[PDB]
Design a protein around this ligand. Structure first.
Ligand SMILES: OC[C@H]1O[C@H](O)[C@H](O)[C@@H](O)[C@H]1O
Ligand SMILES: OC[C@H]1O[C@H](O)[C@H](O)[C@@H](O)[C@H]1O
Ligand SMILES: OC[C@H]1O[C@H](O)[C@H](O)[C@@H](O)[C@H]1O
Ligand code: NA
Ligand code: NA
Ligand code: NA
Lengths: 721, 721, 228, 246
């Protein structure tokens, strides 16, 4: 039985296989249990209350009750708890609050913060509503915890109401916190860098505070809003994992603090850096949605839980189980140097090899012959496109291809008519020179006029043209914050920017619900669950090298479903790494993702074209297995490994892709075991026709044979008889 | 379906959940698979045959078939395989053999080497008989692999026949070998030292050879005949473990070799050191039984598999499920300084506290007033015992106690009538002074006259007295090997000694099947599965300190059932460690084993006696749970841990013992989760009457509370309602 | 030879066996070397300036100079450096400052913040005085680095002057920062707890941010103001 | 205690300033007092080592390192407390048994030797001691009067660190012609070879006379071969080696 239950002083938030049990103790809310389902909880694992030195008390006479030593679900500073706080509100002469629980309600169905991405398909959910008040400050803080009947995930967010007659300022307001009992833990995060996105990091929890965060105005290339707190010694197949994640695409922080007693606090939310929020009387503030997800089946288990939850409750229903088109994109193929002739010749070749969608990338608008001008001027360059965008689109459609288009709406070049008409629309500080990045500026989406303009320009673009797909890019981070009429309004502008973006993209994606929108930020500079609420795929990385893609795809699909993960066969030598890779390997690596092509098909040999046509025919077959099927990591491309191997199961189909980075010699062949098969199943291997029991494939495994050479790959395709 | 199957060139040895699949390849036997059950095996994990440099070939023209690169089940030297060999036989001018498979048979039921401890209860077993021959040398080597229908264990041994007309010499002959595929592995062994027995060691497998071995004539304090080859990252609950073990109590070797290609060979058997075996025409030689056991449920899984197999197929049926008596032993209590009065007063106090069995230790025979004389003279000292042993025994029986007696049959003092009558019975080298150890010598049990004498003396002792229990000690290792009439007969004498011991103890234990025999060797100097075939319990260690016992008991019950593991409450300060421990903690630690008492009850206060009476009443209750129940390690006392915790389940009863070594301060309480409960079960905690669901106890766990102090312990007792 | 030396665009802060070498690069102060004594430093270990994605620039046309990628001795937010800042001052509608080096002086002997504990026995010391200004905000930030002739230690502190006609608010102002080159490092700290003070902790440096801190009003039982 | 409930400013900004202003007020106070009364030895304290930093050590030349006065629990505390700070700063007291914090019996000899790796004092009721215990204490005091220059003025060398896993601690001090070494073992061990303990920073050619046995060892022997460390059976045993360079 799942949902919310209130029994005496206990609150039970019950998702499938995941319970959060909270106790009301005289106004204070204690985290009793977070983990596997428990009914009729008694308190075997209760904190033993004793006098802890320097851990202070709400009353004079009881030294054993301390907010420094109790496990909690939100953190305040100044009442005796010295752990890192998650709510901090300035009012009058202080930023001490003392929010006390007053009342609980339960809601059924749809529920979420206004203007921030939140879960959908919520018919079978219930939400615990915990109403807290600071009577002196006259503030209300309301916590929400939502159950899901079909996933081991709980969703959370809060609402802060100013019921006083004076202005108050929110300084910190995270979206989820949990105090976990002293024990040995490890953490897993996704970090990395541009062209190295989502690098999987694992380390031991140590005394002190560990954090990942963005102060860039976007979640960023180098950190993902995710933190996995793991049982010591967790593996792919075994052990407890708690993933906390944030549905937000702006500045965030995730931290783990291990305090003086060995207790462990984890939290995620809006970054305190570059954030303050003014509330006038009667105004309120809602935080982004945080998710806490659980598995006791190790790192594969958490992957599956997180992927499943994304697919069912985050990614747009219109797309979450829809095969995605195999595309050609011209960016690496031509850069800025193209025109109508070139485009339609590329389109001809794409059709011949069986590609489905043609994406026109950067350079079709305004004066955009390089990356030094024209952002902001979303006006079709008819000279370059050899006529109207309508005529080009019809041309593409007539060749039997869907049509896609690149945009970068959040950006403005100094050299643009937009900047000449409205220089004040750029994020800037009065009396400071601009800071430049790719020689462009960011638009102030905190300015309602900016949002109105972009809504209008883009709505006009989509209504007047038969566009099947949008690539929505964003190629720099935010500097020079100073557009407020006050310091406080500047402190608010980074989050207001995000509200403006979400107003924009939710409007557009919903109004034009047949267009597939792909998010982008110099690749994976903003690949988070905030964006994935509206954009069902993402350009995982500008690094399209087959070998460099291995760790990137490992991280990019770690918590996010494979269907989201754009991956393109590109030219050699690779433009980022300076590396030759076999076309076969570029093919197999991209086919572990959402397959496209990004090279000049017109400059290929007849042989290369044939190979490409064969790759496309293969993937049309594999596409349901890869995009709709279940992913199993078999060998991880971590910082030390010389190999990668990923399996997908989908009904009667099982495929395995194996890649070896460096050639080896006088080294026994790897033995590669498959997972999650029927022991008694009979599995026919396409390449040799041999039939193997699932037991053989899982328990004995495949001797993996390769010729001599770097960056070789192979694929095994099985059909269950 | 379990048993043996022969299908074309494959042999299937199928125990419950464990298969060994061997292929006959033109006379050569290849290890195809060892692990989880596979039917209709095709060969997905076959060795890829290629030319490996310096790996030579049986024929000129095929460079790809090499015994250096094939996975095998026995190893020879000189045919191209350079891995460590497991059979090596001198004949004529060479020790090259080339044993080729000729014929397979299958046996049903009882089967084993004559004169060596082997499995019992074999009705539901089948044995694969692989007959190999070296036609040139005229030798037969027969391999046996036995299935078990009720355990994931396979048993193995070999028989070597000399069918030539000349003498041949066995130099090496191990009992089991397996070549495992290149992969990352760890190994776990039980090593340690006197008063530190069975220390659990874990390490990574590295290129080269790792070995544990005894050349002491007994398996020894410092190494156990066991080696666990583990999947990288195995835990208590998860991952693959293969345990190879030897039913032998003499010199053994276990090795892991990782070769030039990263392949891994493991083997166990009689140590090549101190071993050669002459075979005249028509003579044969059988190796001790090796066991290979498997789990995919981690280290707890291998413990359970190994324990279960011991209980059902090794330990005497008369005792394997029989509660063992709570004993008093006088050794630490009085040493050599006792007489009738003292003994019967000790006996009186033992009865008052509810002890069941009284064991008279060292010093009752011949001239044995210290440890410098009288071994060999098994003549009752009537003066010291204040009359006949019959009168003492009746006295003990009348006080309501069973009666037990210490012996050391394998030993002879220089100062003894035995040595004066037969100085040549001692193991010695002509013209070399004795090497002494505890100022005693070892008897040559390779001498049939020695075995005949001991059979006679001891049979007389047991037939003429109502003895309920025997403690069979053995207090030194073997030096000065030189009793053969030839060098070859000396090389044979260490194994012949073991054959003589097994002839002796099998005879005696079988003839007097109502006596409980407890094995001993300065504690755990010979605690192996060879001895456990005849002695259903063992004195785990002379170290009776409650805290020092924690790692000892951890190792001592790692592969062996708790019922085997003798543990005594002893005096403080502890005689080995110089340490004060709480009587409560001495109690709880000993009650994780087979409980006895070894201190002078007559010198105890009335309070101490009461405590002891309460401990005895408690254990009478716990005894079925501990001795008959299932053991779950919850916190391991390894080299770094400050804690130990062990759980036992038995039907409706669950108990947990927790010990903390050093006092801690300003440190959050440990959270201790129980295992293997019914999630929906309701578990009533005796101490507080609270009822907890199994889910709560497994997933939330117990906050463990202790006062300030070293060596504190507590026990939690649960009844499932 | 120990003390402070100013040679063209390099500043040498020279304690016994420990040098801090800073370069003035058009107003920006770069950490060139912190470690064992080097005279006549050329720049073997200079940051290689290249275009790093999303690492922005003070001018439109030069993509290779980024405060996100240069090694520095104090950190600001909002000029392209996204590393954790060490000075952050609210003025008017912003907390963007852009402090640029204007002038260096050298002091001899006793020197330190008023009303805060500072070193004594300073006869054989010299102090580098780096005067920075944000002309728009009308703020001065002055950095001090003090040499010691008898120890491998350098002391540092800063002074922030409000030369504007409006109130300003300091939000962050640390006392020392250094950007060290990419390499494998470990850190040692003293943490622990009441009745467990100064527990020596050692761990590997990992991507992300590790911190110890007190918000208790005292440095505290559980952390010491030290990082190795 | 630590600071809670910040709200004494007339504005939010003045409250935000009050924690640092507090520190300025403390430093004004203690600098004034310590300077005005420059003959008084001031020892800082905060439930032991709750504020043991270089800010306080500017005015207070010693600090009560920890309220935990257990000889064994003191090992990791003293390791950290003298890690960056000189031994002379580090207050350490022989206290009663069972220890008030740990609930532990320790040998008086070990309580003595551990405290003498710090700045020695006593914190127990001398009036409730036996005549023997008093004699032992008088001997400890006579010893430390001798060791005090070496410990407080000399150079400290960690030889075995009491980290989270170690069963041992050993610290050496050199001061001119004097070298001392203190060794402590936490848990009793059995059938374990004796530790070999090498000394540091000696003259290779120096001749070092060991007080307890009169034997003279070259610095080379002591640094490169080292001392076989012998103890009886038991927990929390300690010994000291005292050397004079001839
Ligand atoms: O400027 C065009 C270019 O912009 C970013 O770098 C994108 O991630 C690329 O895929 C491409 O669209
Ligand atoms: O000599 C008597 C003595 O012998 C060995 O040491 C045993 O292990 C002890 O239990 C005791 O029986
Ligand atoms: O209250 C008195 C007490 O105060 C603190 O706990 C100190 O650290 C102790 O040494 C003692 O002075
Ligand atoms: Na919403
Ligand atoms: Na037998
Ligand atoms: Na000062």
């Amino acid at each position: 039985h799942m949902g919310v239950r209130i029994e005496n002083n206990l609150f039970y938030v019950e998702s499938k296989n995941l319970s959060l049990i909270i106790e009301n103790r005289n106004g204070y809310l204690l985290l009793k249990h977070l983990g596997k389902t428990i009914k009729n909880y008694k308190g075997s694992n209760s904190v033993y209350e004793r006098d802890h030195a320097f851990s202070g008390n709400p009353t004079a006479t009881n030294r054993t009750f301390s907010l420094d030593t109790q496990r909690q679900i939100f953190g305040q500073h100044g009442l005796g708890d010295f752990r890192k706080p998650t709510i901090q509100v300035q009012h009058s002469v202080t930023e001490v609050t003392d929010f006390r629980f007053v009342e609980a309600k339960i809601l059924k169905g749809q529920n979420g913060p206004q203007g921030l991405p939140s879960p959908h398909s919520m018919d079978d959910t219930e939400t615990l509503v915990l109403m807290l008040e600071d009577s002196k400050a006259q503030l209300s803080l309301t916590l929400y915890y939502t159950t899901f009947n079909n996933d081991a995930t709980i969703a959370s967010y809060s609402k802060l109401d100013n019921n006083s007659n004076q202005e108050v300022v929110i300084h910190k307001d995270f979206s989820f916190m949990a105090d976990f009992p002293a024990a040995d833990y490890e953490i897993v995060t996704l970090q990395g860098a541009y062209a190295r996105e989502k690098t999987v990091r694992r380390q031991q929890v140590e005394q002190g505070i560990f954090s990942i965060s963005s102060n860039r105005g976007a979640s960023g290339h180098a950190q993902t809003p995710a933190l996995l707190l793991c049982e010591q010694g967790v593996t792919e197949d075994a052990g407890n994992v708690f993933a906390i994640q944030l549905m937000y695409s702006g500045n965030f922080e995730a931290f783990v603090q291990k305090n003086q007693l060995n207790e462990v606090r984890v939290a995620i939310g809006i970054n305190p850096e570059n954030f303050s929020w003014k509330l006038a009387p009667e105004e309120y503030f809602e935080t982004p949605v945080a998710l806490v997800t659980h598995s006791d089946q190790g790192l594969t288990g958490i992957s599956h839980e997180s992927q499943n939850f994304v697919l069912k409750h985050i990614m747009l229903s219109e797309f979450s189980k829809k095969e995605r088109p195999i595309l050609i994109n011209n960016w690496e193929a031509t850069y800025f140097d193209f025109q109508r002739e070139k485009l339609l010749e590329l389109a001809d070749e794409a059709k011949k090899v069986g590609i489905e969608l043609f994406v026109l990338d950067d350079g079709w608008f305004g004066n955009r012959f390089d990356d030094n001008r024209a952002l902001g001027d979303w006006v079709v360059n008819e000279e370059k496109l050899g006529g109207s965008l309508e005529s080009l689109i019809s041309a593409i459609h007539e060749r039997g291809l869907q049509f896609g288009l690149w945009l970068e709406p959040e950006m403005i070049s100094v050299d643009s008519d937009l900047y000449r008409q409205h220089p004040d629309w750029a994020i800037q500080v009065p009396g400071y020179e601009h800071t430049y990045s790719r020689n462009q500026l960011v638009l102030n989406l905190a300015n309602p006029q900016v949002v109105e303009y972009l809504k209008s320009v883009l709505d006009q673009l989509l209504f007047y043209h038969d566009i099947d797909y949008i690539k929505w890019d964003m190629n720099r981070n935010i500097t020079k914050l100073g557009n407020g009429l006050t310091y406080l309004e500047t402190q608010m502008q980074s989050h207001q920017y995000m509200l403006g973006l979400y107003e924009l993209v939710s409007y557009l994606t919903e109004k034009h619900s047949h267009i597939l929108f792909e998010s982008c930020s110099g690749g994976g500079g903003r690949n988070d669950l905030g964006m994935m609420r509206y954009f069902p795929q993402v350009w995982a990385s500008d690094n399209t090298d087959a070998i460099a893609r291995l760790p990137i795809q490992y991280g990019s699909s770690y918590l996010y479903p494979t269907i989201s993960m754009g991956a393109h066969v590109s030219a050699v030598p690779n433009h980022q790494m300076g590396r030759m890779t076999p076309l076969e390997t570029r093919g197999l690596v991209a086919m572990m993702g959402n397959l496209g092509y990004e090279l000049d098909l017109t400059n290929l040999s007849d042989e290369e074209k044939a190979t490409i046509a064969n790759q496309v025919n293969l993937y049309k077959e594999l596409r349901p297995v890869v995009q709709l099927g279940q992913q199993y990591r078999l060998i991880n491309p971590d910082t030390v490994s010389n190999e990668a191997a990923v399996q997908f199961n989908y009904g009667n189909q099982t495929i395995v892709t194996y890649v070896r980075v460096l050639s080896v010699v006088e080294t026994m062949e790897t033995t590669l075991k498959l997972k999650d098969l029927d022991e008694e199943g009979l599995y026919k291997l396409q390449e040799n026709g041999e039939v193997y029991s699932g037991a053989e494939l899982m328990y004995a495994g495949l001797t993996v044979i390769l010729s001599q050479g770097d960056f070789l790959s192979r694929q095994y395709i099985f059909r269950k008889l």
